[PDB]
C-alpha cells in the first residue's frame, strides 16, 4: 500500500500547483529557477515543463499534457485537475475503505460511457457552414490577445485554411470519415517577413523559397508544364570539354522532346545544363526537397520519375493556374497555385512568432467544431451539469460498483470549484446553489468568471466545442486507470 | 486543526467499540489496580476504570452513563454512532464549513429522524407477560454479550421476570419493576441445564437449628427480629455483668424462664419462623426447636431490605413484642442442597405474589460463570424500558433500522434548500458504521454483504408505500451462506426506548466536541 | 490492533514450551524456584503453573484452565495446556493473510463437537469379558511402572498398590486418603503396606528403655496442653523469705501440672498424641503404668487419626468423654531406616491408610513415589468409570484422521481451519516421542501407515521404539479425560484469541 | 566476508522473497503491471512478466538464479515464466520451515524429485486430445472476451462459431504428414450489402476481384476447370515510355493467347489486366478474364490449386504458356449475385484443406475493426490448437496434484512423506494469487475448489463411477467455480511440463548452498 499512496501524493502535488491556472482570472505563478531566474507566466504548459520531478507519476502527467495539446489548443489545466481529482476522491476508498483497484477501474469504464451520454444531451447544435457563427467560436482564443484587432481577418485565414483539407461525404458503404482534417502537414503555416496582416491571404498550393537559376524569366506562363525528376543533369562517370558539353546536352534533349515550359530538378543543377534549357523557354529550379515532391505531385500531377530517360508520356502540366517569379519581401518566390498554404505577413519577426502560436490555437477551436456540429456551455456549466446527472442514475447502481462511482460525481464539481476560489466568492454557498439549480432549472446555467455570481449563459454564451469536453473526460479516466494499475515501485536495471 | 486532533484521539477509542457491539465482537482484558483480571463485553466497565482528561472523550464517558443508568442496553450504540459523526464531519471541516453550521445541520436532521422512528414500528407487545412473549424481548438482550447461551438463558430469565412483575394495566401512579427486584447468584458445579428459578431470595447459610423444614400448613407466619435473642433488657445499653459465682445461677435460670415465656406467646400466634438479624444465644435454640419454630439467622442487613418487599414483614428493634402488622406470610420453607451444600431457601406456591426472585446459576468454569452473571444483571435493566414510557413499541434490529433511515434522510437532504443539505446528506452516511461493524466481527466480506444489502431495501413497488420487505437485516452467521436471514426468523429487534434515547444522546455528545475550538487549563 | 494479538501468541508458546518436556511419564522435569526459597520440581502441570504466578493475562488463562482441569478430572493438566496453546501457532499465519480470528474459533467448535461423538464410538465398555477381578487392576499398574528403575521390583509393588485401593470404599476414592511415608535406607523389595497411619517420630527427649512397643489393644487419646514441669514462656513469680517455702513453690508449680497429668491416668489410654513436645516429666510417670506418649506430631497426621479410630480432640483432661477413645488391632514400632516409626494396624473404621517405601536414597524414593501416583490414578479410575479409551497415540491420531475426511465435504475457510486443528493434534504424540528419546521424524511417518489401514486402535509403544497396538501394552485411559481436554483447550483458546487489546492499570 | 550455517538459509529466503513478490501481482490476465525506473530517470511499463524480470536489478547472488531461470524458460516455451517464479517461491519458504524440524535439505530435495517423476505419469493418465469439437465449440469464449471491447462483441456469438469451425478444417499435412495448424489462412473480406446477422460462411477460398465484360457467362466448366495464374498483361507490349518514336508488339502477346485456349484453361488471372483485343477472344472460348489481380492473392492460390506463380516465362528464348505444367486441378468456379457484393467463389480442387470467411457489417468503419479484432483473436486459437495435447487452466493442475500426491506420500512412510506433503501444498499459491487481483476472497474460491476435487477423484482410480466431472477451475469475472472444459480456457501441456521441471532446478541449487563467500 506504500506505492499506492505515493501515486496519489505525486499526482496531487503536481496538479495542486496548476489549480489556480484555470480561467481568465487565473492567478499568476512564480517558479524560481536554480540559476536565479523566475517565470512570471501563468500558463500551465510552460510551468510544469521546467519543473524537474522524481516520482514517475508526475512524468505521466507531463506526457499527457503534450498529447492533449495536439488535439485541443486550450484547456490544458482542465484535464490535469479532472484527472487528478478522480484519484484524490478515490483515496479514502482505495486506502481507508480497502476497495480493490480493479473494482474502481471497472467502475470508471462504465462511468466513462454514461459521462459521454450526458454531454451529448446538454450539447446544442451549430451550423458549420455559417461564417458569422464561426467568428464567435474562435473568438474564445482571440480576445485578451494581440490578434483581437485583426480577428476579422484572422477568422478568414483560419476558416479558409481547413476548407481545402476537409472532405464532406457520407454513405453506408465506405462509412463516415467524420471530417478528418490534418493541420500538421497540410495546414502548416509559412511565415514571410514584411508586408501587412491585412494583405495575408490563403494560398491553395505549395510554396518554395528557392529562387530561379536565371535573373530574367517570364513572370507568367499561359500553360505551365511541370516535370518532376530525381537524377540531376550532369556529366556522368564511368577534347574533354567537348564530351562534357555534349553529354549534358543529350540528357537535356530527352526532356525537351515534349517541350516543357518548366523544369524541376530534385538535386543540384550544373551550370552546363542551365544554358541549354535557357533558350528552350523553361525555368529550372535546383535543389528541390524529396518530401516536397509528394505535395508538388498533388498540385501538379507529374509522375515521380527517377532516371531522366524514364520520364513517362503521361506527364502533363494540367491543373496549374499560373507561375509567378514575382518577388515579395526581397526574396524570390514561386507560385504553383486537398492542401493549401498559409502565407503570414507582419511588421517584424516578433509579430510573426506571436501570430504563429495564436493562429494554431485559433484553428484548433475551429477544427473541433468540424468533428461534429455540437457545442457545450463553458464556465463550469457542463462540468456541474454532468455531476447532477450522475447522482440520479445511482438508483440502479446498487452493488459494489456504486462506491467508486460516487468519486466521479464529486470530481466533476472540482472544475467549477477552482473558478470560484479564483473569483473570491464563497465556494460552499455557490456550489450548493449551483447543484440544486440543475435539479430544477435548465442545465445551461453556468458560472461567470468576471463576476462570480450564478447567471444564465444567454447573456454571455462562451460556447466551447464538445471535443474539449470529450477528450477531457476520456483522458481523465485513462489517466486515473493508469496510476491505479501500477501498485508497486521497483527501481534499478 | 486542533478540533481534528480531538477526533483522532476518539478514533483510538472508536476502534475499541468496533469489537464490542455484536455477538461476534471481542472481549477486552481489564487489569484493576488491585491485581484482578476483569474480562467483559460491556464497555461501561472500561470507561469507569479509566479516568479521562481530554473533554472530547470525557463527554462520551458521561454520555455512556446517560445510556447505562436509564437503560440496560445500547451502551455500544451511543459510543459507535457518536464516534462516526465526527469522522464524517472531517470532510466538512476540510472544505471550510464552520463547525457552527455543522451543528445546525444535525439539529434539523435529528427532528427528521425522530419523526421517522414512529413510522418504523411494526409490531407492539400486549403486555401479556406470557412465557413466550417475554422471550421476544430478552432474546436480543442476551445477544452481543454471551454466545451459545442465548437459547439456554432465555427460559431461565423469563421465568423470574413474570414472578416479580404483576399483571395490571391503565395504572401509572405506582411504579413497578425495581432494579433490586431481581437477584442473581452463582455456584460452582453442574451445568446450565440443571439451573432452576427460585421465587424468592436464596439463603446460603446452613440450618444450624434442629428443625430442618416447616410443615405443609398454608401461609406460615414469619417474624423478622433485629434484636438478638436473649433475656429482655433495656434497649439503651443494658450490658449484663458478672460479679460472683452466686449470681451465675440466677443469670442462667433467669434466662430460662424469660425466653420460654416470650416464645410461648409467639408460637401461639401462629409464627413458625423467626428471622434473627443478630447473634442467637444457646438457650434460644432449645425452646424454638421444641415448639416447631424454624430458626433463621440473617446477619447481613442488605438481604433484610429485599425481604420486606416479599412478605411485608418489618424489622423490630426491640424483642418480645410480636406485632401482627410486622409479621409476614410464606407458603413453603424447606432446605435444599445446592452445589453440594445443604442450604435453607425461601419460596412460595400460588400465593402472596413476590417482588423479589433469585436465579441459581451453575457452570463448570468460575471465570466464565461470573460473566454470565453480569450479562443477566445487564439484562434486568433492559426490561425496565418496557414500562409505560413508550415500552410497547419496537423497531427492527440487527442493522435493519440504520439502513432504512439512509433513504429517508437523504430524500429530505436534496429537498431542503440551503446550506443545511451538506450536513443532512452526511448525517445518513454515518449510519454505515453499524452494518460494517457486524460484518467485520463476523468475518464477512465488506465488498459483498454491505453493497448487496442496499439492493434489498431498494425496490420498485407500484404504490405510494415501500413494502414487501421489512425483514432485511445484517447477517451474523459465522458460516458462509448465500444472502441474509430475516427479522421474523430469529425475532431480533430493537426497542423504541433504546433507539430513540440513543439518538438524542449521540447528537449532544458530538455537539460538545464540535463546539470546543480550544481548551483553557490552569496549573494544579 | 494486530500487534497485541501477535504478542499474545509468543506468550502462549513460552508457557507451552516449558510444559513440553513435562508431557508423558518419561518426560523431563522442570525446575521452578519460588520466592519462598523452596526448591520445587514436578512434572504435573497443575503444580507447575500454580507456582509460576505469571502476570501476563493471557498466560494466566492457561494457568486458570489448568485448575479447572485439576478440579473436575485432575489428570492431563499438562496436555490440556499444550493442546490449547498449539492453536495459537496454527492461527498465527492465518492472521497475516486476512482471515478473521472469529472464523477460526468458529471452526474449532464444529470440529470438537464432531470429535466428542467419535470418542463415544471408540469407548468400549468391558468389565468381566476376558478379564478377572484381581488381574484387572494388576495389569494396569505394571503399565505406568514400566521403563522405570522399579520395573524389576514391580512384582512386589503391584500387590501393595492394588490392596491400597481395595482398602477403601469403591464408591468414594481419593488420592489424598492414601498416605506415603519415605523411609531412607533399606532394600526396595522389603517394603510393606500399613492399614493405619504413621508419623515421623521427631521425639528427641531422653527417658528411653521404657514404654515397650508391644501392645494388644491400646486406647488412643489426644493431648492438648503441656504436661512438662517448666513451661515454654511464662512462669510464676513468688517472693518468700522462708527456706522451707523455696521447696514448697517447686512442688506448688508441679501440683498444678500434676492435676491435669493425673487425670490422663483416669482415662486409661496407653496412646497419647499431642501436637506439642512432651517433656521428660510426663513420660517418667507414664513409664511405670506402661503408657506411651509422643509429642511434636504434625497437624496433617492428627486429622488421619480422628478418621482412623474415630477419636476426638479435647482441650482439657477433665471433660474428656469415654467414647472419644479408640483402639487398633496391633501396634508395632519398627526400627527400619535407622529410626523408630510408630504405626497402626487393623483399624476397621479407618478411612485412610499408609504405604511405606524403602530405597537407597531419599532422591531415589521421591521418583518412586511420584511414579506410583500415576499408577494410582489409573487403578482408581478403572472401577469408577467403566468407559475407557485407548491412549498413547491411539485416540490422538484418530481424532485428527476423521476431521480430514469431514473437511472435504465442508466448503469455505472452515475447511483449512479444521485441517489446521487436525494438524494441531499432532503435537501430543510428537512430544511423547521426543521426551522418550525416540526419533519424532520416523515414528510420525511410520505410524500413519498402519493408521490408514482401517484399524483405529494402533498406538505408540513406550518401551521399545516401534509402531503397534496399545491394547496389548495395557495402556488404558478414561473417556472423561479426552472429552474434557478438547473442551477445556478450546474454551481457553477462544478467550485468548478474543482479546484485541490488553489494558493494564498501575496502582 | 563468509557466512555459514543456518544464517545463510534465512538470507536466501528473504532475498528471493522480494524478487518473487514482483511477479505475484502480474500473474493471470487480471494481473497488474508496474514501472521500472533506471538511474537516468526514464522508465517503461509492460504487462509481460518476462520483460520485467529481464530489467530487474538483483543485487543478492541468491536471487540471480531466478534471473537466469526466466531466460531459459523463454527460450523453450516462451510463455508462463511468471508462474514459474511463484512456484519456486513457496518451495523455498516451506523448506526453511523444516530446518527447525532437524530435516536435512538433501532429503527435502530428494523428496521433490520423486514427486516430480510421479506427477509426469499422472498428466498422461488424465489429459487427452481435444474432444467435443462437434455439435458445440468451447473456443468461442476466447474470441468473445477479446472482441467484447468492440461492436462485433455483441454479434460475436454467431461469429465465434464461424471462426472456430474455420480453423478446424484448415489443418493439413503440411510437409510429410505434419498435421499442424498454419498461421496464415482464412482470407478476410468485407461486405456492405446487409447487416452483420446475415453473414454467410463460404466453404472455401473466395477470391475478391471483378470481371471485364458482361458478355461472358458467370458459370462455366462445372465438372473440372484449370486455373492459369499469370503476371504480365495481355495488352500490347510497350518498349519504353521515355523514348520518342520517330519512324510485332501485338503478335508477341497474341501468340501466348493461342497457347491459352489450346491448353483448356477457362480461368485467366492477370495482375496488370487484359486488353480489349484479348477480351473478345475469350468470349468465344467462354474464358472468364480478370483485370488487375492482387499479387498476394495469386501466390496463395498457386499452392492451394497446385499451380505456380511466375512473373515471366522464357526458358531459353522460348515462347509458350507451359501447357499442363502450371495448370492446376479445380473442381468448379461459379459466380452468383451476392446482393451488392462481387467475389469469385472457388469451391473444389485437388487438395486445399483451406477455408475463408467473408465478414459483413453496417459500414466499412466497423468492418475495419472486425478484421483487426479477428487477427488477434484467432491468433490465440492457432497457438492453442497447435499443441496436440492441451490442459485447462484456472488452477486445475495445482489442485489435482495436491490431492494425488497426498495419498502417494504413503508409499514411503519414512522421510519423503513430509517432503511430498509440503510439495503438494506448495502449488496452492498459484490459485491463491489469481483471486487477489480478481477482488474475490482467496480463502473462499480456492477452498471450495479443493472440496470438489476431493470427492471427484475418489472413484477415478477404481474405474467405476456414476457422474464424475474433473477440471474444475476458477472464473475470475463472475467469481464462481465453473468447468474449464465447458468454459474453453486451454493451455499447452508442454508449458507446465517444462515449467515444473525448470522451477525445481532453480530451487535445488538454492537449497544446496550452505555458504556464501563474497570477496
Structure-block grid coordinates of residue C263: 487425670
- For residue D70, is it left (φ>0), alpha (ψ between -120 and 50) or beta? alpha
Query: Could you tell me if C460 and C432 are in contact, meaning their C-beta atoms sit under 8 angstroms apart?
Result: yes
Tell me the CATH number of domain D1-130+389-519, given options 3.30.200.20, 2.40.40.20, 1.20.1260.10, 1.10.560.10: 1.10.560.10
CA-nearest residue to D102 within chain C is C441
Q: What string of DSSP letters covers C68-105?
A: HHHHHT-S-HHHHHHHHHHHHHHTHHHHHTT--HHHHH
Query: Could you tell me if A5 and A85 are in contact, meaning their C-beta atoms sit under 8 angstroms apart?
Result: no
**Pairing mode, if any, of strands D333-334 and D344-346?**
antiparallel
Burial (CB count <10 Å: 0-12, 13-18, 19+), residue A184: exposed
Of B46, B365, B478, the CB nearest to C102: B478
Sign of the CA dihedral C59, C61, C67, C73? negative
Structure-block grid coordinates of residue D69: 531461470
B320: Cα separation from own chain's centroid: 41
Structure-block grid coordinates of residue D356: 475463408
Interchain contact C71–D (C-beta under 8 A):
no
- Residue D365's Cβ-side half-sphere holds a number of Cα atoms within 13 Å equal to 8
Of D410, D415, D454, the CB nearest to C449: D410
Q: What string of DSSP letters covers A442-454?
A: -TTEEE-SSS-SE
Distance CA B230, CA A51 (A): 103
Structure-block grid coordinates of residue A287: 535543389
B-to-D residue pairs, Cβ atoms closer than 8 angstroms: 3
Distance CA A14, CA A85 (A): 12
Cα–Cα nearest to D53, from D37, D71, D41? D71
**DSSP assigned state of A96:** I
Judged by DSSP in three states, D318 sits in: coil
C68: Cα separation from own chain's centroid: 15
Q: Which residues of A touch D32 (CB under 8 A)?
A: 101-102, 485-487
Amino acid at each position: 500500500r506504500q506505492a499506492q499512496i505515493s501515486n496519489i501524493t505525486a499526482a496531487k502535488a503536481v496538479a495542486d500547483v496548476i489549480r489556480t491556472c484555470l480561467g481568465p482570472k487565473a492567478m499568476l505563478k512564480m517558479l524560481l529557477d536554480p540559476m536565479g531566474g523566475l517565470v512570471l507566466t501563468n500558463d500551465g504548459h510552460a510551468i510544469l515543463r521546467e519543473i524537474d520531478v522524481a516520482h514517475p507519476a508526475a512524468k505521466s502527467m507531463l506526457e499527457l499534457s503534450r498529447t492533449q495539446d495536439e488535439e485541443v489548443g486550450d484547456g490544458t489545466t482542465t484535464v490535469i485537475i479532472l484527472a487528478g481529482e478522480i484519484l484524490a476522491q478515490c483515496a479514502p476508498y482505495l486506502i481507508e475503505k480497502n476497495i480493490h483497484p480493479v473494482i474502481i477501474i471497472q467502475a470508471l469504464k462504465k462511468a466513462l460511457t454514461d459521462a459521454l451520454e450526458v454531454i451529448k444531451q446538454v450539447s446544442k447544435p451549430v451550423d458549420v457552414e455559417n461564417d458569422a457563427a464561426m467568428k464567435k467560436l474562435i473568438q474564445a482564443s482571440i480576445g485578451t490577445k494581440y490578434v483581437i484587432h485583426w480577428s476579422e481577418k484572422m477568422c478568414e485565414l483560419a476558416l479558409d485554411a481547413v476548407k481545402t483539407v476537409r472532405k464532406d461525404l457520407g454513405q453506408t458503404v465506405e462509412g463516415e470519415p467524420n471530417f478528418e482534417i490534418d493541420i500538421k502537414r497540410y495546414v502548416r503555416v509559412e511565415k514571410i517577413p514584411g508586408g501587412d496582416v491585412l494583405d495575408s491571404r490563403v494560398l491553395k498550393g505549395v510554396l518554395l523559397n528557392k529562387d530561379v537559376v536565371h535573373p530574367k524569366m517570364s513572370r507568367h506562363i499561359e500553360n505551365p508544364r511541370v516535370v518532376l525528376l530525381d537524377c540531376p543533369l550532369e556529366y556522368k562517370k564511368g577534347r574533354i570539354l567537348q564530351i562534357e558539353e555534349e553529354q549534358v546536352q543529350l540528357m537535356c534533349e530527352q526532356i525537351l522532346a515534349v517541350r516543357p515550359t518548366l523544369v524541376i530538378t530534385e538535386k543540384g543543377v550544373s551550370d552546363l545544363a542551365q544554358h541549354y534549357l535557357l533558350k528552350g523557354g523553361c525555368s529550372v529550379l535546383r535543389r528541390v526537397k524529396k518530401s516536397d515532391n509528394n505535395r508538388i505531385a498533388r498540385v501538379t500531377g507529374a509522375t515521380i520519375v527517377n532516371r531522366v530517360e524514364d520520364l513517362k508520356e503521361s506527364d502533363v502540366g494540367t491543373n496549374c493556374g499560373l507561375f509567378k517569379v514575382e518577388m515579395i519581401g526581397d526574396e524570390y518566390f514561386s507560385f504553383l497555385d486537398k492542401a493549401c498554404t498559409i502565407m503570414l505577413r507582419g511588421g517584424s519577426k516578433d509579430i510573426l512568432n506571436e501570430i504563429d502560436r495564436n493562429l494554431q490555437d485559433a484553428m484548433a477551436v475551429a477544427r473541433n467544431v468540424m468533428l461534429s456540429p455540437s457545442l457545450s456551455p463553458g464556465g463550469g456549466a457542463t462540468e456541474m451539469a454532468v455531476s447532477v446527472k450522475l447522482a440520479e442514475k445511482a438508483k440502479q447502481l446498487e452493488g459494489i460498483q456504486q462506491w467508486p462511482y460516487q468519486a466521479v460525481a464529486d470530481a466533476m464539481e472540482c472544475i467549477p470549484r477552482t473558478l470560484i476560489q479564483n473569483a473570491g466568492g464563497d465556494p460552499i454557498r455557490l456550489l450548493s446553489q449551483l447543484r440544486a439549480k440543475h435539479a430544477q432549472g435548465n442545465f445551461t446555467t453556468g458560472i461567470d468568471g468576471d463576476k462570480g455570481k450564478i447567471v444564465d449563459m444567454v447573456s454571455y454564451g462562451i460556447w466551447e466545442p464538445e471535443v474539449i469536453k470529450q477528450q477531457s473526460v476520456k483522458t481523465a479516466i485513462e489517466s486515473a486507470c493508469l496510476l491505479l494499475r501500477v501498485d508497486d515501485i521497483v527501481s534499478g536495471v | 486543526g486542533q478540533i481534528i486532533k480531538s477526533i483522532a484521539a476518539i478514533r483510538e477509542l472508536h476502534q475499541m467499540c468496533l469489537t464490542s457491539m455484536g455477538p461476534c465482537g471481542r472481549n477486552k482484558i481489564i487489569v484493576n489496580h488491585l491485581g484482578k483480571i476483569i474480562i467483559t463485553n460491556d464497555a461501561a466497565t472500561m470507561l469507569r476504570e479509566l479516568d479521562i482528561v481530554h473533554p472530547a472523550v470525557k463527554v462520551l464517558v458521561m454520555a455512556t452513563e446517560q445510556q447505562k443508568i436509564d437503560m440496560g442496553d445500547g451502551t455500544n450504540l451511543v459510543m459507535i454512532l457518536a464516534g462516526e459523526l465526527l469522522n464524517v464531519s472531517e470532510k466538512l471541516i476540510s472544505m471550510g464549513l464552520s463547525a457552527v453550521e455543522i451543528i445546525q445541520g444535525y439539529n434539523m436532521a435529528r427532528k427528521f429522524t425522530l419523526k421517522e422512528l414512529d413510522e418504523m414500528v411494526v409490531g407492539e407487545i400486549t403486555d401479556k407477560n406470557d412465557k413466550n412473549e417475554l422471550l421476544k424481548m430478552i432474546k436480543p438482550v442476551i445477544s452481543s454479550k454471551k454466545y451459545g447461551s442465548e437459547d439456554i438463558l432465555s427460559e431461565l430469565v423469563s421465568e423470574a421476570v413474570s414472578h416479580v412483575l404483576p399483571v395490571a394495566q391503565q395504572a401509572g401512579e405506582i411504579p413497578y419493576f425495581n432494579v433490586d427486584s431481581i437477584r442473581v447468584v452463582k455456584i460452582m458445579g453442574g451445568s446450565l441445564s440443571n439451573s432452576t428459578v427460585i421465587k424468592g431470595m436464596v439463603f446460603n447459610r446452613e440450618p444450624e437449628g434442629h428443625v430442618k423444614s416447616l410443615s405443609e400448613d398454608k401461609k406460615h407466619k414469619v417474624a423478622v427480629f433485629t434484636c438478638p435473642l436473649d433475656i429482655a433488657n433495656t434497649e439503651t445499653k443494658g450490658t449484663v455483668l458478672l460479679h460472683n459465682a452466686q449470681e451465675m445461677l440466677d443469670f442462667s435460670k433467669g434466662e430460662e424462664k424469660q425466653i420460654d415465656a416470650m416464645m410461648k406467646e409467639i408460637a401461639d400466634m401462629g409464627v413458625e419462623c423467626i428471622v434473627a438479624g443478630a447473634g442467637v444465644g444457646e438457650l434460644a435454640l432449645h425452646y424454638l426447636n421444641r415448639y416447631g419454630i424454624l430458626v433463621l439467622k440473617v446477619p447481613s442487613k442488605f438481604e433484610l431490605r429485599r425481604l420486606c418487599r416479599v412478605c411485608g414483614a418489618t424489622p423490630l428493634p426491640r424483642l418480645g413484642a410480636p406485632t401482627p402488622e410486622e409479621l409476614g406470610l410464606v407458603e413453603t420453607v424447606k432446605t435444599m442442597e445446592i452445589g453440594g451444600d445443604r442450604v435453607t431457601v425461601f419460596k412460595q406456591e400460588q400465593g402472596e405474589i413476590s417482588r423479589t426472585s433469585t436465579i441459581i446459576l451453575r457452570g463448570a468454569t468460575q471465570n466464565n460463570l461470573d460473566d454470565i452473571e453480569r450479562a443477566i444483571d445487564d439484562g434486568v435493566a433492559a426490561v425496565k424500558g418496557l414500562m409505560k414510557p413508550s415500552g410497547g413499541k419496537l423497531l427492527p434490529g440487527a442493522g435493519a433500522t440504520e439502513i432504512e433511515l439512509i433513504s429517508r434522510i437523504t430524500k429530505y437532504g436534496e429537498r431542503t434548500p440551503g446550506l443545511l443539505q451538506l450536513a443532512i446528506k452526511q448525517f445518513a452516511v454515518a449510519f454505515e458504521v453499524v452494518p460494517r461493524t457486524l460484518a467485520e466481527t463476523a468475518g464477512l466480506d465488506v465488498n459483498e454483504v454491505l453493497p448487496n444489502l442496499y439492493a434489498a431495501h431498494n425496490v420498485t413497488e407500484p404504490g405510494a408505500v415501500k413494502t414487501d420487505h421489512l425483514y432485511k437485516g445484517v447477517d451474523i452467521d459465522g458460516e458462509s451462506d448465500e444472502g441474509v436471514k430475516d427479522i421474523r426468523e430469529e425475532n431480533i429487534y430493537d426497542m423504541l426506548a433504546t433507539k430513540k434515547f440513543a439518538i438524542n444522546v449521540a447528537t449532544e455528545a458530538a455537539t460538545t466536541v464540535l463546539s470546543i475550538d480550544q481548551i483553557i487549563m490552569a496549573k494544579k | 490492533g494486530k500487534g497485541q494479538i501477535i504478542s499474545n501468541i509468543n506468550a502462549c508458546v513460552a508457557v507451552q514450551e516449558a510444559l513440553k518436556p513435562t508431557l508423558g511419564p518419561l518426560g523431563s522435569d522442570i525446575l521452578i524456584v519460588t520466592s519462598n526459597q523452596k526448591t520445587t520440581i514436578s512434572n504435573d502441570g497443575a503444580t507447575i503453573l500454580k507456582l509460576l504466578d505469571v502476570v501476563h493475562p493471557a498466560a494466566k488463562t492457561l494457568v486458570d484452565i489448568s485448575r479447572a482441569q485439576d478440579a473436575e478430572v485432575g489428570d492431563g493438566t499438562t496436555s490440556v495446556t499444550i493442546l490449547a496453546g498449539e492453536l495459537m501457532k496454527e492461527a498465527k499465519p492465518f492472521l497475516e493473510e486476512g482471515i478473521s480470528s472469529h472464523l477460526i474459533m468458529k471452526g474449532y467448535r464444529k470440529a470438537v463437537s464432531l470429535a466428542v461423538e467419535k470418542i463415544n464410538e471408540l469407548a468400549v465398555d468391558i468389565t468381566s469379558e476376558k478379564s478377572s477381578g484381581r488381574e484387572l487392576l494388576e495389569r494396569c499398574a505394571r503399565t505406568a511402572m514400566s521403563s522405570k528403575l522399579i520395573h524389576n521390583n514391580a512384582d512386589f509393588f503391584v500387590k501393595m498398590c492394588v490392596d491400597a485401593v481395595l482398602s477403601l470404599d469403591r464408591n468414594d476414592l481419593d488420592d489424598k486418603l492414601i498416605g506415603i511415608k519415605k523411609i531412607p535406607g533399606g532394600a526396595m523389595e522389603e517394603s510393606l503396606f500399613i492399614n493405619g497411619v504413621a508419623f515421623k517420630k521427631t521425639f528427641s527427649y531422653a527417658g528411653f528403655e521404657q514404654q515397650p512397643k508391644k501392645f494388644n489393644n491400646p486406647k488412643i487419646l489426644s493431648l492438648n496442653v503441656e504436661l512438662e514441669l517448666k513451661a515454654e514462656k511464662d512462669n510464676a513469680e513468688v517472693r518468700v523469705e522462708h527456706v522451707e517455702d523455696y521447696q514448697a513453690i517447686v512442688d506448688a508449680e508441679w501440683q498444678l501440672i500434676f492435676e491435669k497429668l493425673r487425670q490422663v491416668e483416669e482415662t486409661g489410654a496407653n496412646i497419647v498424641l499431642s501436637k506439642l513436645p512432651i517433656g521428660d516429666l510426663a513420660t517418667q510417670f507414664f513409664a511405670d503404668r506402661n503408657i506411651f506418649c509422643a509429642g511434636r506430631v504434625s497437624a496433617d497426621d492428627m486429622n488421619r487419626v480422628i478418621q482412623a479410630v474415630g477419636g476426638s480432640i479435647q482441650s482439657t483432661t477433665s471433660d474428656i468423654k469415654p467414647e472419644h477413645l479408640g483402639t487398633c488391632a496391633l501396634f508395632e514400632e519398627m526400627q527400619i531406616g535407622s529410626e523408630r516409626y510408630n504405626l497402626f494396624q487393623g483399624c476397621p473404621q479407618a478411612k485412610t491408610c499408609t504405604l511405606l517405601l524403602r530405597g537407597g536414597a531419599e532422591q531415589v524414593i521421591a521418583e518412586v513415589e511420584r511414579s506410583l501416583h500415576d499408577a494410582i490414578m489409573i487403578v482408581k479410575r478403572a472401577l469408577q468409570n467403566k468407559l475407557i479409551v485407548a491412549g498413547g497415540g491411539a485416540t490422538e491420531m484418530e481424532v485428527s484422521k476423521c476431521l480430514r475426511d469431514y473437511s472435504k465435504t465442508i466448503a469455505g475457510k472452515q475447511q483449512m481451519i479444521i485441517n489446521a486443528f487436525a494438524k494441531a493434534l499432532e503435537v501430543i504424540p510428537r512430544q511423547l516421542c521426543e521426551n522418550a528419546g525416540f526419533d519424532a521424524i520416523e515414528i510420525l511417518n511410520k505410524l500413519r501407515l498402519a493408521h490408514s489401514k482401517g484399524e483405529k486402535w494402533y498406538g505408540v509403544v513406550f518401551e521399545t521404539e516401534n509402531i503397534g497396538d496399545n491394547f496389548a501394552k495395557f495402556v488404558w485411559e478414561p473417556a472423561l479425560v479426552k472429552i474434557n481436554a478438547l473442551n477445556s483447550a478450546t474454551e481457553a483458546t477462544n478467550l485468548i484469541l478474543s482479546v484485541d487489546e490488553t489494558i493494564t492499570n498501575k496502582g | 566476508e563468509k557466512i555459514s550455517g543456518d544464517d545463510i538459509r534465512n538470507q536466501n529466503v528473504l532475498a528471493t522473497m522480494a524478487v518473487a513478490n514482483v511477479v505475484k501481482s502480474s500473474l493471470g490476465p487480471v494481473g497488474l503491471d508496474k514501472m521500472l525506473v533506471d538511474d537516468i530517470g526514464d522508465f517503461t511499463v509492460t504487462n509481460d512478466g518476462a520483460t520485467i524480470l529481464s530489467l530487474l536489478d538483483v543485487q543478492h547472488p541468491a536471487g540471480k538464479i531466478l534471473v537466469e531461470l526466466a531466460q531459459q524458460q523463454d527460450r523453450e516455451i516462451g510463455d508462463g515464466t511468471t508462474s514459474v517464479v511463484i512456484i519456486a517461491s513457496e518451495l523455498l519458504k516451506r523448506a526453511n520451515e523444516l530446518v527447525k524440524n532437524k530435516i536435512h535439505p538433501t532429503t527435502i530435495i530428494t523428496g521433490f524429485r520423486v514427486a516430480l517423476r510421479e506427477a509426469i505419469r499422472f498428466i498422461n493418465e488424465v489429459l487427452s486430445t481435444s474432444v467435443d469439437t462437434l455439435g458445440k465449440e468451447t473456443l468461442i469464449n476466447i474470441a468473445k472476451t477479446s472482441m467484447s471491447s468492440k461492436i462485433i462483441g455483441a454479434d460475436s456469438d454467431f461469429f465465434s462459431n464461424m471462426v472456430v469451425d474455420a480453423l478446424l478444417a484448415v489443418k493439413t499435412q503440411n510437409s510429410k504428414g505434419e498435421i499442424k495448424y498454419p498461421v496464415k489462412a482464412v482470407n478476410v473480406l468485407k461486405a456492405h450489402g446487409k447487416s452483420a446477422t446475415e453473414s454467410l460462411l463460404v466453404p472455401g477460398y473466395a477470391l475478391n476481384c471483378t470481371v471485364a465484360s458482361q458478355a461472358m457467362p458467370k458459370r462455366i466448366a462445372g465438372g473440372n476447370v484449370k486455373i492459369a495464374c499469370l503476371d504480365l498483361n495481355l495488352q500490347k507490349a510497350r518498349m519504353a515510355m521515355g523514348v520518342q518514336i520517330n519512324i510485332r508488339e501485338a503478335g508477341i502477346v497474341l501468340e501466348r493467347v493461342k497457347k491459352i485456349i489450346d491448353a483448356g484453361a477457362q480461368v485467366v488471372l492477370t495482375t496488370k489486366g487484359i486488353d480489349d483485343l484479348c477480351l473478345k477472344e475469350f468470349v468465344e472460348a467462354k474464358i472468364m478474364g480478370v483485370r488487375r489481380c492482387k499479387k498476394e492473392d495469386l501466390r496463395r492460390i498457386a499452392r492451394a490449386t497446385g499451380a505456380t506463380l511466375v512473373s515471366s516465362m522464357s526458358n531459353l528464348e522460348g515462347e509458350e504458356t507451359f501447357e499442363s505444367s502450371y495448370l492446376g486441378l479445380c473442381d468448379e468456379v461459379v459466380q452468383a449475385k451476392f446482393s451488392d457484393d462481387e467475389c469469385i467463389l472457388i469451391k473444389g480442387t485437388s487438395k486445399h484443406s483451406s477455408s475463408s470467411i467473408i465478414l459483413r457489417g453496417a459500414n466499412d468503419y466497423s468492418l475495419d475493426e472486425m478484421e483487426r479484432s479477428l487477427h488477434d483473436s484467432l491468433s490465440v486459437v492457432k497457438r492453442t490448437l497447435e499443441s496436440g495435447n492441451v490442459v485447462p487452466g484456472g488452477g486445475c493442475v495445482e489442485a489435482a496434484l495436491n490431492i494425488y500426491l497426498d495419498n502417494f506420500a504413503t508409499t514411503v512412510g519414512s522421510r519423503e512423506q513430509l517432503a511430498i506433503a509440503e510439495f503438494a501444498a506448495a502449488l496452492l499459491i498459484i490459485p491463491k494469487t489469481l483471486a487477489v487481483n480478481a477482488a474475490k476472497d482467496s480463502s473462499e474460491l480456492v477452498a471450495k475448489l479443493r472440496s470438489y476435487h476431493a470427492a471427484s477423484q475418489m472413484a477415478k482410480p477404481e474405474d467405476v463411477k456414476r457422474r464424475s466431472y474433473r477440471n474444475y477451475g476458477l472464473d475470475l469475472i463472475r467469481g464462481k467455480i465453473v468447468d474449464e472444459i465447458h468454459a474453453g480456457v486451454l493451455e499447452p501441456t508442454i508449458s507446465k511440463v517444462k515449467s515444473l521441471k525448470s522451477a525445481l532446478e532453480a530451487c535445488v541449487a538454492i537449497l544446496r548452498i550452505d555458504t556464501m563467500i563474497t570477496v
